[PDB]
């Protein structure tokens, strides 16, 4: 049922085009990246504090010492990526900031969609496309898909509307 | 393309106003030290 919700928002709201969703995407994927890159970094900048091949045992939760080298981690990422964290407090705050902000942004876009205040179209694209039948973009290609979704799922997905679409009105490319 | 004519000034001020704000704060921070 949630999958249908996803596809509904594509066909009717063109939700993938909404910059508030895109900020949510960047926040969620940004978080997951931060999550994986921070865990990986710590685990590969560990100090040798025990003798065994299992490095987990060599940590005591009451030790005062940092258990991995921030200095070496900073050099690594500075030389691999150009920039690196240098402040552990900023780093961990940033990990709070990124996915929390991302989610807040997508919520705002959904509030707009409550009103059908969609980012559905680009008017400039449509004016050109109407007048110029050789002009095609991935933008116009995706609206055709939206129009297919709407006409083909609406009768069964909104049964209280008694939509009867005879075969001849259904939008369809060649053969399919 | 027949784009919104105010999109240019919208975009220019959208960049310029908060960037200038940050630059003002940064430079006066540097002259403190």
């Amino acid at each position: 049922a949630i999958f249908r919700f996803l596809l509904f928002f594509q066909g009717f709201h063109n939700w993938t085009l909404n910059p508030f969703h895109m900020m949510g995407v960047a926040g969620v994927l940004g978080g997951a990246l931060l999550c994986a890159i921070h865990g990986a970094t710590v685990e590969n900048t560990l100090f040798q504090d025990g003798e065994g091949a299992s490095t987990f045992r060599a940590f005591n939760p009451t030790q005062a010492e940092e258990t991995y080298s921030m200095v070496t981690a900073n050099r690594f990422w500075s030389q691999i990526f150009g920039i690196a964290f240098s402040n552990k407090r900023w780093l961990h705050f940033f990990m709070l900031f990124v996915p929390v902000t991302g989610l807040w942004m997508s919520a705002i876009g959904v509030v707009g969609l409550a009103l059908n205040l969609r980012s559905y179209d680009f008017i400039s694209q449509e004016i050109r496309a109407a007048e110029d039948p050789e002009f095609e973009t991935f933008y116009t290609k995706n609206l055709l898909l939206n129009e297919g979704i709407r006409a083909w799922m609406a009768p069964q997905d909104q049964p209280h509307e008694n939509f009867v679409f005879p075969e001849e009105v259904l939008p369809r490319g060649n053969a399919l | 393309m027949e784009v919104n004519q105010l999109g240019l000034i919208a975009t220019a001020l959208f960049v310029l106003v908060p960037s200038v704000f940050l630059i003002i704060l940064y430079v006066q921070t540097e002259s403190q030290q």
Partner: peptide, 30 residues
């Protein structure tokens, strides 16, 4: 004008990359 605007912003981001890497505040130890 919109093409100029898009490319101008993108170019500003690349220049910022240059400064953020080569003209960063150097991290100093303790």
């Amino acid at each position: 004008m919109e093409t100029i605007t898009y490319v101008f912003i993108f170019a500003c981001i690349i220049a910022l990359f240059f400064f953020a890497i080569f003209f960063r505040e150097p991290p100093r130890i303790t």
